[PDB]
Design a protein around this ligand. Structure first.
Ligand SMILES: Nc1nc(=O)c2c([nH]1)NC[C@@H](CNc1ccc(C(=O)N[C@@H](CCC(=O)O)C(=O)O)cc1)N2C=O
Ligand SMILES: Nc1ncnc2c1ncn2[C@@H]1O[C@H](COP(=O)(O)CP(=O)(O)OP(=O)(O)O)[C@@H](O)[C@H]1O
Ligand SMILES: *P(=O)(=O)O[C]C([C])([C])[C]([O])C(=O)[N][C][C]C(=O)[N][C][C][N]C(=O)[C]([N][C]=O)[C]([C])[C]
Ligand SMILES: CC(C)[C@H](N)C(=O)O
Ligand SMILES: [Mg+2]
Length: 1181
C-alpha cells in the first residue's frame, strides 16, 4: 500500500528488492542522485529504503521520516561503518555479516533491526565476497520486510566500537579486487607494520666486545696483527687527538688510506671521537678524490705521506704514521653519540648523473650487524676477508659485522685480490671461513678448489652461476647503498632460472607497488620499495632529491625508499629480482628484459660471461647486442642457432660482440657504459629487391639469401604483409607459395616469370559483401539476439577526461564509413546505405567495482542494422577508475578492425593527426563480388566440393545430455601459459618451419582426438583474416571468414610428424579460404539442422600480440554466450598466451571444464618437451 522511495548507487542497484516491493503493490520511486530536505521527490513517501546510497541524508529528512528510513548495509555493524564495508571485513579480519538498520543522523549508526552472519571461503575473490554479501542482504530484506513494515521488530542499539572508513582509505588497495581471501591475507602479513628500538652505537657494541675477547686476534695484515685490546687502545689514542681537534657528533672526517691495519684503526677512531668517516680510496681518479673531498664537509683528513699529496692540501691532514697524532690516553672516550648520528658517508658511482653522498646512521649499521651475527652464526673462531674497497658498503660488511662477533679480519694482499688462484691459496692457508664477494668476483672464485670457506655471501648484481668447487653455502644478498649494505638475504639451495634475492632482514619490510604507489598482488611485478631500520638519513647536501627518493607514502605515511628496481613476490615469500625499470625495452613488437637472455647465452660451453644491451639506431628502433667473454670469437650463426633452441627470434641479439674480458668498475660490476659499439648477401637484382622487402616486413637490417622466413620472426600476419609489399612491385605471391618457398633463394626462381582497389563513386545504394549478407541473415532470424555483439572495456585512470574519450569516439564515426553504414532489404537483395553523419549513443554512469559487470550487461542490447551508427559507448566511473566500454555489432567490428579502432583511439587521445582513410569497405565488397565470377573462385570452391563430399568424422566431446535444440548459453575459463613456456613453444615452431598457430592447432587437434578414443581424424573450425585485397588492411568492417579444418592424427607417429601433416592440410585450406562459409556448407551437402552445428562443434581462433598498448588494455567482455559447444581462443598477452575456453553451459559445468583445462595443460606440457615422442605416449592424466 505505502509509497516507497528507493535510494541507491544507480537505478539498477538491488533490482530484486525493488521487484519484491512492487509485487506487494508498493509504488517504488528510484533515486540515485542526492536528495534535499525541501525536495519534490519526498512527496507522498511513506517509506525510504536506501541501498548503497552515495549521499548523506540531511538532519531534516531523518527527523521527518524517523522510524521509516531503512538501510541495507553489507557488514556486521558496528563493524565496518562507511565505504567498502566488505573489503575491510576481510582485510581487518572482522566479524562478517549483513545488517538492516534504521537510519539516524550519522553514518551507519542507527539501531539494528535484523542482523545475519556470513562466511567467505578462502578461495573466493573479493568480487565474489562483494556479490555474495549483496545477495545475502537482499534476500534478508525480502524475508523480513513484512515484519519491518508492521513494526513488529524490536530495534536494538549498536554496540560501541567499530571502524568508520572513507573513500580514500582504500586507495592503497585499489589493485586487489581480483585476489582471493587467502591471497589477500597473505599479502597483509608481508606488507603491514607490526605492533624494540636500537639504543646503541657501533663503538659502544665494539667496546663491549673488547672486554669479552681482549686477547683475540682482531685484524691481520700479512704477518702483522692486532688483538681486540691492542686495536681498541690505539684507536682510543687517535680518538682523543681527533676529538681534541674539534670533532663533534655528525662531523665528517675523511680517510684516505690503503687497506691496512692503519685503516681499521682510523675508522674506529673517527667513531669513538664522535664523527662519521668518509672513505676515499686512493686508487680513485684524481677528479673523483677532489670531488669527494669538496662535496664532503670534512675538515680533517686521515692519510699517509704516500697519499698526502692527492688531497691538494685541501684539508687539515692528520698523519696516521706521525706519533704526535696519538694521545697517551688508552681509555675509551666518554660517549657523546646517539644511535641517530652519522656513522659514515659513501658516494654513489658518478655514472648515472653526479655522484651523491649517502648518509648512514649508527642505528642503520647496528641493525645489520646484530642481524648478521646470528643469521650466519659467526663465532670468535671465524675469519673474514677485507676484500671490497673501503669506499663501498660491501666493506662495511667485511669490517663491522665480524668485529662485533669477535672474529679476525684479514686484509687481502693487493697482489692476491685480482689473482683468485692466489686468493684461494691465502684462504686455504689461513683458514678463512666467511666473507662477502661482489657477484663478479664471486662467480670467478667458484672455479677455485676451496676448502676453507663455510659461507660465501655475494651481491651487487644478478647471480648467474652457482656450480662451484667448494663445500660452502652460497648466499645471494640484495640492497642499495641508500639502505645499508643489504636488506634481503637468500640461501642458494638449488638451481634457479632466476635466483631469488630472498626475504627481508631484521626490522625491514619490502613493498611491491605500481606507479601510483598502490600495493601489487603477490606474484605481480612492481617497483621495489624498502621500509624499516635500514633507510639512511638521505643524500648529502641534496634535500630535494632526498625527498624524491625517500618518500613519505601519501596513504600509509611511512618513510620508504624508491629503489628503481623491478621485483615481484613469490608465493613462498621470497622476493624475485627482475632488473631495473629502465632496462625494459620494446624489440620488434615485444616488451622484454634483455637480462633474461643472458643465462641462455651463458650456458654455452665456450662462454663464461655475458651481458645483453639494448641499443638505438637512426630509425629510432631498438636492437639487442649480446656481449660475451670467450677464449675465441664464436661464429654468429652458431650463437644464433644455440639460442634458437629456447628463444623466439625477437629475443636473439642481432649482433654478437666477442671480448677478452668485460670492463668493470671500482665496485666490481660490469661497466655497461664502457662496452664497445658495433663495427649470403643478395647479388642478383631481384634478390636485392626481395631482401629490402623482407628487411622491412620483419624489421631486420640484413637478410640472408637462405634465411628461413619463420626462423627470422615471420608469422601469418607478416606473410600477408609480404604479399602486400610484393604487389607494390607488380609481383603476385600466394600464401601457400611462401611456405613451400620460405627463402629468398626459393622465391627468386618463383617470381622471375611473374591493380589498386578502385574507390566507388557516389551512389544511393551499394552492394554488400558475402559475409555482410550472412550477418544480416542471422540477425534477421532472431531479431533481438545479441550473440553477434562485440563488447570491449578499457580501464582509464580518473585523470582522463570523460569528454575527450567521447570526442575521440565521435571523430572515429566521421572517419570510418562503417560507423555510418546501415543495412536494408531491397527486394531479395541485402543492400547498404551510407549516411554523412550519425549521433553516437554515449552514456555516463557511476557504479562500484563489484557492480561493473552488472551495469554493463544492461547496456548490451540488440542492434537495428538499418540504424547508424552500429556502435554504442559509455563510461562507468567507480571510486578508483574510469571504465570505458563500447558495444558494436559483429557485421562491422571484426578482429583486425578492433586493432585499428584501438590504434587510432590511442592516437586521438594523444593529440595526433590522422590522414584521411584512402579506401572504403564498399569498394572491397564490389571488388569481391565481381571476383566470385572468376576462374580462381571456381578453383577454390572446387577444393571444398572434393574435400567435404565423403563421410565426415564426427567428433564427440564429453558433455552432459545435449539440449534438444541449439543453445547458446555460455561461460568462460582462462588458462595462462607463462612467458617461459610460451618462449619455448615459439622457438620450437620456428625451428621446424611452423608458425605458433600451426603448433597450437596440432595440440588442440590431438587433444580432441584423445577425447574421441584416439580417432584418426578430427574436424574443427577456425577463423581467417578475410582481408583478400591488400588495400583493406586499414578498413573497418567484417572480413573474417569461417573455415572447416579436416585434420588427421597418426598416434603411431611422432609429435613432429603430426605437426608437419597438420601443416600439409592447413595450407590448402588457407589457399582456398576466400569462399564464403555458406557456399562451403552448400558444397558439402550439409544443412543447419538438429541440435549440432553444421560442420563442427569446436572452434579454434588465435590472435597475435597487440599492436599498441591501448589494445593490450582492451578486454573482450562475454555476455554469457557460446556460439559453439566449445571455443578456444589463444591471445598473446604479456609475452604469454591467454587461452580462453568459451563453452556451452548446458554441455559443461564449471567442474568438467576445469578438468578439461588441466588435461589440456598437461597435454601441452608433454608435447612441448616431447617433440620426437610418439603421440600415443601423451596422456591426459
Ligand atoms: N544519516 C545517514 N546515515 C546513514 O547511515 C546513511 C546515510 N545517511 N546515507 C546513505 C548511506 C551512507 N552513504 C554514504 C556515502 C558516501 C559518503 C561520503 O561521502 N563519505 C566521504 C566522507 C563523508 C564526509 O564528508 O564526512 C568519504 O570520503 O568517504 C558517506 C555516506 N547510509 C547507510 O548506509
Ligand atoms: N643480489 C642482487 N641481485 C641482483 N641485483 C642486485 C643485487 N644486489 C644489488 N643489485 C643491483 O644493484 C643495485 C644496488 O647496487 P649499489 O651498491 O647500491 C650501487 P648501483 O645502484 O649499482 O649504482 P650507483 O653507484 O650509480 O648508485 C640494486 O638497486 C640492484 O639494481
Ligand atoms: P599463421 O600464424 O599460421 O596464422 C594463421 C591464421 C590464424 C589463419 C591467420 O592467417 C589469421 O587469419 N589470423 C587472424 C585470425 C583472427 O581474426 N583471430 C581473431 C578472431 N576473433 C574475432 O573475430 C572476434 N571478434 C573481435 O575480436 C570474435 C569472432 C570472437
Ligand atoms: C653488500 C652491498 C655491496 C650490496 N650487495 C649492494 O648491492 O650494494
Ligand atoms: Mg644507485
Amino acid at each position: 500500500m505505502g509509497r516507497i522511495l528507493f535510494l541507491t548507487t544507480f537505478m539498477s542497484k538491488g533490482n530484486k528488492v525493488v521487484r519484491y516491493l512492487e509485487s506487494l503493490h508498493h509504488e517504488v520511486v528510484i533515486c540515485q542522485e542526492k536528495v534535499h530536505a525541501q525536495s519534490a521527490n519526498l512527496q507522498e513517501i511513506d517509506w525510504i529504503v536506501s541501498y548503497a546510497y552515495g549521499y548523506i541524508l540531511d538532519k531534516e529528512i531523518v527527523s521527518r521520516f524517523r522510524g521509516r528510513i531503512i538501510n541495507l548495509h553489507p557488514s556486521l555493524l558496528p563493524w565496518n561503518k562507511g565505504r567498502d564495508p566488505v573489503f575491510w571485513s576481510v582485510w581487518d579480519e572482522t566479524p562478517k555479516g549483513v545488517t538492516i538498520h534504521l537510519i539516524d543522523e550519522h553514518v551507519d549508526t542507527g539501531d539494528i533491526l535484523v542482523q545475519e552472519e556470513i562466511a567467505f571461503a578462502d578461495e573466493d575473490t573479493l568480487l565474489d565476497c562483494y556479490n555474495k554479501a549483496n545477495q545475502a542482504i537482499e534476500e534478508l530484506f525480502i524475508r523480513e520486510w513484512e515484519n519491518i513494515v508492521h513494526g513488529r521488530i524490536a530495534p536494538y542499539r549498536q554496540t560501541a566500537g567499530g571502524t568508520l572508513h572513507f573513500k580514500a582509505d582504500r586507495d592503497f588497495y585499489k589493485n586487489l579486487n581480483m585476489t582471493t581471501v587467502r591471497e589477500l591475507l597473505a599479502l597483509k602479513r608481508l606488507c603491514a607494520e607490526p605492533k624494540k628500538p636500537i639504543d646503541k652505537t657501533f663503538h659502544q657494541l665494539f667496546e663491549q666486545q673488547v672486554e669479552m675477547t681482549p686477547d683475540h686476534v682482531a685484524v691481520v695484515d700479512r704477518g702483522q696483527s692486532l688483538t681486540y685490546k691492542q686495536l681498541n687502545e690505539r684507536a682510543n689514542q687517535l680518538a682523543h687527538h681527533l676529538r681534541g681537534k674539534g670533532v663533534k657528533p655528525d662531523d665528517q672526517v675523511a680517510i684516505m688510506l690503503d687497506k691496512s691495519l692503519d685503516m681499521i684503526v682510523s675508522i674506529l677512531a673517527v667513531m669513538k671521537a664522535g664523527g662519521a668517516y668518509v672513505p676515499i680510496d686512493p686508487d680513485y681518479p684524481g677528479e673523483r678524490i677532489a670531488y669527494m673531498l669538496a662535496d664532503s664537509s670534512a675538515a680533517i683528513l686521515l692519510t699517509n705521506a704516500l697519499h698526502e699529496e692527492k688531497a691538494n692540501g685541501a684539508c687539515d691532514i692528520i698523519d696516521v704514521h706521525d706519533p704526535d697524532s696519538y694521545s697517551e690516553n688508552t681509555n675509551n672516550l666518554p660517549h657523546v653519540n646517539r644511535p641517530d648520528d652519522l656513522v659514515y658517508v659513501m658516494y654513489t658511482s658518478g655514472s648515472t648523473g653526479l655522484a651523491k653522498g649517502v648518509m648512514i646512521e649508527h642505528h642503520n649499521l647496528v641493525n645489520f650487524c646484530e642481524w648478521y651475527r646470528p643469521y650466519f652464526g659467526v663465532t670468535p673462531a671465524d675469519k673474514a676477508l677485507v676484500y671490497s674497497s673501503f669506499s663501498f658498503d660491501g666493506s662495511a660488511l667485511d669490517i663491522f659485522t665480524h668485529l662485533l662477533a669477535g672474529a679476525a679480519l684479514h686484509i687481502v694482499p693487493s697482489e692476491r685480490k685480482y689473482d683468485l688462484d692466489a686468493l684461494n691459496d691465502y684462504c686455504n692457508q689461513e683458514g678463512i671461513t666467511i666473507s662477502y664477494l661482489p657477484t663478479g668476483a664471486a662467480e670467478q672464485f667458484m672455479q677455485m678448489d676451496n676448502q676453507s670457506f663455510r659461507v660465501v655471501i655475494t651481491g651487487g648484481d644478478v647471480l648467474k652461476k652457482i656450480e662451484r668447487n667448494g663445500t660452502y653455502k652460497l648466499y645471494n644478498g640484495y640492497g642499495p647503498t641508500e639502505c645499508t649494505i643489504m636488506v634481503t638475504m637468500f640461501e642458494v639451495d638449488k638451481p634457479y632460472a632466476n635466483i631469488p634475492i630472498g626475504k627481508p632482514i631484521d626490522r625491514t619490510r619490502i613493498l611491491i607497488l605500481d606507479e601510483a604507489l598502490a600495493l601489487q598482488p603477490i606474484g605481480v611485478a612492481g617497483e621495489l620499495f624498502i621500509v624499516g631500520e635500514g633507510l639512511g638519513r638521505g643524500y648529502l647536501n641534496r634535500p630535494e632529491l632526498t625527498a624524491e627518493k625517500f618518500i613519505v607514502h601519501p596513504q600509509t605515511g611511512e618513510r620508504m625508499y624508491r629503489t628503481g628496481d623491478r621485483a615481484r613476490f613469490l608465493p613462498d615469500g621470497n622476493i624475485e629480482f627482475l632488473g631495473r625499470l629502465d632496462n625494459l625495452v620494446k624489440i620488434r613488437g615485444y616488451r622484454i628484459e634483455p637480462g633474461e637472455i643472458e643465462p641462455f647465452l651463458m650456458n654455452h660451453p665456450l662462454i663464461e660471461l655475458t651481458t645483453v644491451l639494448a641499443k638505438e639506431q637512426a630509425d629510432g628502433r631498438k636492437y639487442l647486442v649480446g656481449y660475451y667473454v670467450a677464449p675465441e670469437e664464436i661464429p654468429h650463426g652458431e650463437l644464433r642457432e644455440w639460442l634458437g633452441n629456447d628463444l623466439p627470434d625477437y629475443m636473439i641479439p642481432t649482433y654478437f660482440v666477442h671480448m677478452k674480458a668485460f670492463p668493470l668498475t671500482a665496485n666490481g660490476k660490469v661497466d655497461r657504459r664502457a662496452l664497445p659499439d658495433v663495427q649470403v648477401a643478395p647479388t642478383d637484382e631481384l634478390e636485392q629487391q626481395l631482401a629490402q622487402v623482407w628487411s622491412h616486413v620483419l624489421g631486420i637490417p640484413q637478410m640472408g639469401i637462405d634465411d628461413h622466413f619463420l626462423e627470422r620472426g615471420g608469422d601469418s600476419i607478416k606473410v600477408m604483409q609480404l604479399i602486400h609489399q610484393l604487389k607494390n612491385i607488380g609481383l603476385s605471391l600466394r600464401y601457400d607459395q611462401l611456405f613451400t618457398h620460405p627463402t629468398i633463394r626459393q622465391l627468386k626462381r618463383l617470381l622471375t616469370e611473374q591493380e589498386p582497389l578502385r574507390e566507388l563513386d557516389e551512389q544511393a545504394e551499394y552492394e554488400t559483401s558475402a559475409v555482410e549478407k550472412r550477418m544480416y541473415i542471422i540477425q534477421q532470424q532472431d531479431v533481438e539476439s545479441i550473440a553477434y555483439n562485440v563488447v570491449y572495456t578499457i580501464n582509464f585512470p580518473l585523470t582522463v577526461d570523460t569528454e575527450q574519450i567521447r570526442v575521440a569516439l565521435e571523430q572515429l564515426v566521421l572517419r570510418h564509413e562503417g560507423l555510418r553504414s546501415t543495412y536494408h532489404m531491397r527486394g531479395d537483395e541485402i543492400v547498404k546505405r551510407i549516411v554523412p553523419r550519425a549521433e553516437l549513443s554515449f552514456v555516463r554512469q557511476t557504479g562500484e567495482e563489484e557492480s561493473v559487470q552488472s551495469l554493463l550487461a544492461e547496456q548490451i542490447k540488440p542492434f537495428d542494422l538499418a540504424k547508424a551508427p552500429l556502435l554504442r559507448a559509455g563510461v562507468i566511473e567507480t571510486a578508483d577508475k574510469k571504465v570505458l566500454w563500447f558495444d558494436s555489432h559483429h557485421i562491422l567490428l571484426d578482429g583486425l578492425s578492433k586493432s585499428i579502432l584501438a590504434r587510432e583511439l590511442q592516437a586521438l587521445l594523444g593529440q595526433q593527426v590522422l590522414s584521411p582513410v584512402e579506401k572504403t569497405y564498399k569498394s572491397f565488397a564490389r571488388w569481391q563480388n565481381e571476383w566470385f565470377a572468376s576462374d580462381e573462385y571456381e578453383q577454390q570452391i572446387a577444393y571444398w566440393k572434393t574435400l567435404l563430399q565423403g563421410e565426415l568424422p564426427a567428433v564427440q566431446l564429453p558433455t552432459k545430455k545435449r539440449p534438444p535444440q541449439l543453445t547458446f548459453d555460455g561461460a568462460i575459463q582462462m588458462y595462462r601459459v607463462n612467458p617461459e613456456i610460451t618462449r619455448k613453444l615459439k622457438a620450437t615452431a620456428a625451428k621446424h618451419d611452423l608458425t605458433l598457430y600451426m603448433l597450437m592447432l596440432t595440440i588442440v587437434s590431438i587433444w580432441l582426438s584423445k577425447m574421441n578414443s584416439d580417432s584418426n581424424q578430427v574436424i574443427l573450425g577456425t577463423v581467417t583474416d578475410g582481408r583478400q585485397h591488400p588495400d583493406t588492411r586499414e578498413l573497418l568492417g567484417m572480413f573474417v571468414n569461417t573455415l572447416p579444418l579436416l585434420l588427421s592424427i597418426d598416434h603411431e607417429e611422432s609429435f613432429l610428424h603430426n605437426l608437419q601433416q597438420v601443416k600439409a592440410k592447413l595450407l590448402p585450406a588457407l589457399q582456398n579460404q576466400y569462399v564464403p562459409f555458406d557456399k562451403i556448407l552448400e558444397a558439402a551437402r550439409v544443412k543447419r539442422e538438429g541440435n549440432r552445428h553444421p560442420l563442427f562443434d569446436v572452434m579454434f581462433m588465435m590472435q597475435g600480440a597487440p599492436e599498441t598498448e591501448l589494445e593490450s588494455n582492451m578486454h573482450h567482455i562475454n555476455a554469457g554466450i557460446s556460439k559453439f559447444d566449445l571455443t578456444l581462443e589463444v591471445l598473446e598477452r604479456e609475452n604469454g598466451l591467454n587461452i580462453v575456453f568459451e563453452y556451452n553451459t548446458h554441455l559443461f559445468d564449471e567442474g568438467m571444464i576445469l578438468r578439461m583445462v588441466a588435461q589440456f595443460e598437461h597435454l601441452l606440457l608433454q608435447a612441448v618437451h616431447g617433440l620426437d615422442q610418439q603421440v600415443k605416449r601423451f596422456e591426459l592424466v
